[PDB]
UniProtKB/Swiss-Prot annotation, chain A:
GO terms for biological process: cytoplasmic translation; negative regulation of DNA-templated DNA replication initiation; ribosomal large subunit assembly. Belongs to the universal ribosomal protein uL2 family. One of the primary rRNA binding proteins. Located near the base of the L1 stalk, it is probably also mobile. Required for association of the 30S and 50S subunits to form the 70S ribosome, for tRNA binding and peptide bond formation. It has been suggested to have peptidyltransferase activity; this is highly controversial. In the E.coli 70S ribosome in the initiation state it has been modeled to make several contacts with the 16S rRNA (forming bridge B7b, PubMed:12809609); these contacts are broken in the model with bound EF-G. This protein can be partially replaced in vivo by its H.marismortui (HmaL2) or human (L8, from the 60S cytoplasmic ribosome) homolog. One of its GO terms (molecular function) is zinc ion binding. InterPro entries: NA-bd_OB-fold (IPR012340), Rib_uL2_dom2 (IPR014722), Ribosomal_uL2 (IPR002171), Ribosomal_uL2_bac/org-type (IPR005880), Ribosomal_uL2_C (IPR022669), Ribosomal_uL2_CS (IPR022671), Ribosomal_uL2_dom3 (IPR014726), Ribosomal_uL2_RNA-bd_dom (IPR022666). Part of the 50S ribosomal subunit. Forms a bridge to the 30S subunit in the 70S ribosome, contacting the 16S rRNA. Interacts weakly with S6 in one of the 3.5 A resolved structures. In pull-down experiments interacts with CedA. Changing residue 229 to Q: Loss of peptidyltransferase activity in reconstituted ribosomes. No change in rRNA binding or assembly into ribosomes. PROSITE patterns: RIBOSOMAL_L2. This is Large ribosomal subunit protein uL2. The modification N6-acetyllysine is found at residue 241. GO terms for cellular component: cytoplasm; cytosol; cytosolic large ribosomal subunit; DnaA-L2 complex.
From Swiss-Prot, chain B:
The keyword Repeat does not apply. The gene is rpmH. Part of the 50S ribosomal subunit. One of its GO terms (molecular function) is structural constituent of ribosome. This is Large ribosomal subunit protein bL34. HAMAP family: Ribosomal_bL34 (MF_00391). The keyword Ribonucleoprotein applies. InterPro entries: Ribosomal_bL34, Ribosomal_bL34_CS. One of its GO terms (biological process) is cytoplasmic translation. GO terms for cellular component: cytoplasm; cytosolic large ribosomal subunit. Keywords: Ribonucleoprotein, Ribosomal protein.
Curated annotation (Swiss-Prot), chain C:
This is Large ribosomal subunit protein uL23. The keyword Protein biosynthesis does not apply. It comes from Escherichia coli (strain K12). PROSITE patterns: RIBOSOMAL_L23. InterPro entries: Nucleotide-bd_a/b_plait_sf, Ribosomal_uL23-like, Ribosomal_uL23/eL15/eS24_sf, Ribosomal_uL23_CS. Changing residue 18 to A: Binds normally to ribosomes; strongly reduces trigger factor binding. One of its GO terms (molecular function) is rRNA binding. Keywords: Ribonucleoprotein, Ribosomal protein, RNA-binding, rRNA-binding. Signal peptide: none annotated. It comes from the Bacteria. GO terms for cellular component: cytoplasm; cytosolic large ribosomal subunit. Belongs to the universal ribosomal protein uL23 family. The gene is rplW.
Amino acid sequence: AVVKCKPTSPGRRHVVKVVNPELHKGKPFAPLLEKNSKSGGRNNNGRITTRHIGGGHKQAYRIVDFKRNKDGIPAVVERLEYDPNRSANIALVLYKDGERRYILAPKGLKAGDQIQSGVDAAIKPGNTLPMRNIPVGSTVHNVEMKPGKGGQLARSAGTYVQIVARDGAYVTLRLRSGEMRKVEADCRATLGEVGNAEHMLRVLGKAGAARWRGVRPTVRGTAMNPVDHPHGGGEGRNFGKHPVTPWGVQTKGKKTRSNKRTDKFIVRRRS
Amino acid sequence: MKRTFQPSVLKRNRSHGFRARMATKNGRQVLARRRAKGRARLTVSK
Amino acid sequence: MIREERLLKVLRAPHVSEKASTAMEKSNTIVLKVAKDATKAEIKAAVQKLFEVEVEVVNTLVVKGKVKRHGQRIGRRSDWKKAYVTLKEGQNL
Amino acid sequence: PVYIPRPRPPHPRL
RNA sequence: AGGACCGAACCGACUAAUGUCGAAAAAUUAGCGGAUGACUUGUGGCUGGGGGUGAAAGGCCAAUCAAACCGGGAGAUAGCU
RNA sequence: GCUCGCCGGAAGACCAAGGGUUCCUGUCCAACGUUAAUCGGGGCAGGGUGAGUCGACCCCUAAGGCGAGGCCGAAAGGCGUAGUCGAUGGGAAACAGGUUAAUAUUCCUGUACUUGGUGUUACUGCGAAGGGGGGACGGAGAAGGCUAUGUUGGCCGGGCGACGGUUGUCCCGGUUUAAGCGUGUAGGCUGGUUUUCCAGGCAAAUCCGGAAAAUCAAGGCUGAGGCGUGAUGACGAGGCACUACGGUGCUGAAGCAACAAAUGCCCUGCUUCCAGGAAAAGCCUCUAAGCAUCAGGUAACAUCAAAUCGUACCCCAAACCGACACAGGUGGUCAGGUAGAGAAUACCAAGGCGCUUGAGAGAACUCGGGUGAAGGAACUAGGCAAAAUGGUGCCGUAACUUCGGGAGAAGGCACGCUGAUAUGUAGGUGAGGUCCCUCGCGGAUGGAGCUGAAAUCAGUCGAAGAUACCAGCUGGCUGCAACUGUUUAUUAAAAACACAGCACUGUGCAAACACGAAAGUGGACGUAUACGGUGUGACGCCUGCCCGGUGCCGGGAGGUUAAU
Ligand SMILES: [Mg+2]
Ligand SMILES: [Mg+2]
Ligand SMILES: [Mg+2]
Ligand SMILES: [Mg+2]
Ligand SMILES: [Mg+2]
Ligand SMILES: [Mg+2]
Ligand SMILES: [Mg+2]
Ligand SMILES: [Mg+2]
Ligand SMILES: [Mg+2]
Ligand SMILES: [Mg+2]
Ligand SMILES: [Mg+2]
Ligand SMILES: [Mg+2]
Ligand SMILES: [Mg+2]
Ligand SMILES: [Mg+2]
Ligand SMILES: [Mg+2]
Ligand SMILES: [Mg+2]
Ligand SMILES: [Mg+2]
Ligand SMILES: [Mg+2]
Ligand SMILES: [Mg+2]
Ligand SMILES: [Mg+2]
Ligand SMILES: [Mg+2]
Ligand SMILES: [Mg+2]
Ligand SMILES: [Mg+2]
Ligand SMILES: [Mg+2]
Ligand SMILES: [Mg+2]
Ligand SMILES: [Mg+2]
Ligand SMILES: [Mg+2]
Ligand SMILES: [Mg+2]
Ligand SMILES: [Mg+2]
Ligand SMILES: [Mg+2]
Ligand SMILES: [Mg+2]
Ligand SMILES: [Mg+2]
Ligand SMILES: [Mg+2]
Ligand SMILES: [Mg+2]
Ligand SMILES: [Mg+2]
Ligand SMILES: [Mg+2]
Ligand SMILES: [Mg+2]
Ligand SMILES: [Mg+2]
Ligand SMILES: [Mg+2]
Ligand SMILES: [Mg+2]
Ligand SMILES: [Mg+2]
Ligand SMILES: [Mg+2]
Ligand SMILES: [Mg+2]
Ligand SMILES: [Mg+2]
Ligand SMILES: [Mg+2]
Ligand SMILES: [Mg+2]
Ligand SMILES: [Mg+2]
Ligand SMILES: [Mg+2]
Ligand SMILES: [Mg+2]
Ligand SMILES: [Mg+2]
Ligand SMILES: [Mg+2]
Ligand SMILES: [Mg+2]
Ligand SMILES: [Mg+2]
Ligand SMILES: [Mg+2]
Ligand SMILES: [Mg+2]
Ligand code: NA
């Protein structure tokens, strides 16, 4: 899993890789790929809306089933593949009716294993079923927020949510953030944590190992001039200001949430 | 020393061509100005 | 069907030069100054009728007009089309 | 002459 | 294997001389740095002025940038020559 | 015309972009050419660009543009669905010779190949804006087989050398031939086949997917090159005939082998890695409605069409961008000999050029060089600049270290040529012969040849043997920045910026945040192991006290407090 690349060149010295042997060493499934053109932060009018996005490698988008709406019909995990669009490893799965899809890999799921979705599934990891049929306190993942929506919570590597309680038609989830949210119990939720838990241990070693992940560098405020950024200019490492984003809104502690149309579903706020 | 005008008929037209003018309103006003001044060559569409 | 009132329009003049000379000499090709559009089939039929001689292939090109500084004024000449007509075997002028 | 070359900087008599 | 080493193409511009009404509105000569990559390049496209873009120098945005260029307000205003 | 010099991974040859007659011929020297000009990319006139196969066009899509209706917007207008454009990519097909003053894969000769139209000929389920397959892909590495190509040998032709020798393991030249068709190789991948069933492929489908069970162990697809043919043909060193003195008409020998060998082809292959590597059509099948003598499909033959535009010329340049015939810039392709690791470099081939002012002189002084007595940094701000070092093989190699490095540390030794070991070695390559059988482009053996290191021993020459070109100066202490990188195009390349790493903080998804009056879009087709912002800047040891102030976060009990 976690390997330390030998310091046989500066920039190779610090690298820590995740050499997953079990990952499929071949081409991904054809009918489930589609083109994923890069943007670089830019949008309709063409302006950099999100700074620092740019460059990197081409990647095709693997159509992962997040909905898990194929009830009853069992399925076997053909193989586990590396997905450049995610931090979790995808799994090409085949249902008994010759239809093959992608799912996220829970922690304990090798190839050859078997899983199936719907209300009457078992509670083995990989199985999806509404969060009314899932027990209390079990750790699930790929959680929905609306019945039929698709699954939005706990989609990243090593992440998972926990059903703290079900009070009527609503389940309270100790979200991976530590926030206690409260959604409908009729929202399906894949069981078990997400795999690739050793994702957060890689260290990328050098600047290129990020530049090809597609992150142009971030220039500090202080370096910039007064016109470029609130922290600006000076005769050598001068700040005297209060930390704010390039648009003068306070960073380093300022709650910037205002929904008023969902604040009722948050049991308790973040930790 | 690399100068500024690196000619290319494709870009030249797509930027200042006749249909590039007549596309939008401002371009058609540019054409109107050219015709009011009475120029020989309205646009650059050699 | 291609009308006589167009075949009488296609052909304009027979080009004369060293190249037209040697072409008529060695390859049975008469060189003509044909109209602007003057498609190969149009020229084919127009010669097959107006000259009543037998055509094999028509090979055509468009020469561009020179720029001519008549006096002190930059002029130009019309771009016209020259067509090589390889007669089958017989004869022509 | 539509191009007007800039003058060379004067000696810094500060 | 490697933002690995030496070193041409290629990319650049550290030193020195020349050049400074030049051969050249930034170059030549001798060297010099990278040279499988955060590299370089072709073609086309996108972002436009208080706007763009910026590995950030107020840099670049047509030999012009502490706010482009063109036209208009405009014969601004100028207790200053 | 003869010498001389230069280039030759270019200053040669062919294109693209760009230019637009600059191409060729005749005529002229007013202007243009930094001089002269008979010359010219100059002036005037005439000629020249021939395509089923090359490109465009056209079919298909990328980024992206426009965008019915649509959503939004004081107006203009913005976004965007269906859709339609858009190559820098995907999609059918021609080669070798001959020719012009100038075009030629376009003309001519020969040899082909592609796609459709139509008609007859039979046999047949055909049928799509729909399904499936395909096209369809990264970086790096390595090896095997090849080829281009060159070298030598063998032939063929010619020569017997301006002064020594030169009919001999002597000299010079040529020894070339394509596409297509047949073959199916080195080699690459893949089990194959028959039935039967099925909640998948928005319906269907025999196609795909998926199960079963038998099935034979083979097949299928891909495939460089070679071989045969193309070709009793062309080309051909040259010889002769006539000279528009330019070249035309004929005749025209040999036209093999080995070895070396690509950065090119097999190979989009193989192995491997993480950074996870366009799409759509053409293509092949499946069926839907509709029709099932028909239509339509396939095959065979015949025949027709392949239109339109480009094609001259420059293209690291006097023709494109730079105002100039400007020491600048300009993408792609080919790349020969000797020496060499090499596309470096030196000298050369093909080929091109002598840079559009020259002639004298041989003052100072300036520029580019060469050498230098003795000293050797005393110069100077500073060893700036020069000088010096420089290669391959082996020996040897410290502190420190993050254990990799440092390190090419430092330093030393050998290097030419000749002969022998060895009538050239080890090695490579491999004929003939022979045997085997899947009988062949087969395997085993076999070694003729053809190449060909490296080492040792002996000798010899010179002042010097990595002899030219080319080609590290070395070490010690230290500040800063971890490092590779980026930066003020055009006086600043750094300690500045970035960086991987660390931290705080925001953000629960219709996320935060950002562009946008809004629709919307980016974030992200991502989901707290994620994204944004801010600071710090690998790594090691660490980061101490202060919340008075400003800010941020949390409270709401009290005072004040807006519109109303
Ligand atoms: Mg960022
Ligand atoms: Mg950072
Ligand atoms: Mg930064
Ligand atoms: Mg400010
Ligand atoms: Mg400062
Ligand atoms: Mg200070
Ligand atoms: Mg023809
Ligand atoms: Mg390197
Ligand atoms: Mg190097
Ligand atoms: Mg240089
Ligand atoms: Mg280096
Ligand atoms: Mg500028
Ligand atoms: Mg201003
Ligand atoms: Mg005034
Ligand atoms: Mg006024
Ligand atoms: Mg040429
Ligand atoms: Mg002219
Ligand atoms: Mg000429
Ligand atoms: Mg005269
Ligand atoms: Mg003159
Ligand atoms: Mg002329
Ligand atoms: Mg043509
Ligand atoms: Mg639109
Ligand atoms: Mg289209
Ligand atoms: Mg193209
Ligand atoms: Mg020519
Ligand atoms: Mg060969
Ligand atoms: Mg010989
Ligand atoms: Mg290479
Ligand atoms: Mg696709
Ligand atoms: Mg029929
Ligand atoms: Mg040509
Ligand atoms: Mg000149
Ligand atoms: Mg020049
Ligand atoms: Mg060479
Ligand atoms: Mg050279
Ligand atoms: Mg000169
Ligand atoms: Mg002198
Ligand atoms: Mg001497
Ligand atoms: Mg001395
Ligand atoms: Mg001395
Ligand atoms: Mg001193
Ligand atoms: Mg002194
Ligand atoms: Mg020096
Ligand atoms: Mg010297
Ligand atoms: Mg030197
Ligand atoms: Mg050096
Ligand atoms: Mg100090
Ligand atoms: Mg540094
Ligand atoms: Mg550096
Ligand atoms: Mg500068
Ligand atoms: Mg810092
Ligand atoms: Mg502190
Ligand atoms: Mg306090
Ligand atoms: Mg407060
Ligand atoms: Na405080």
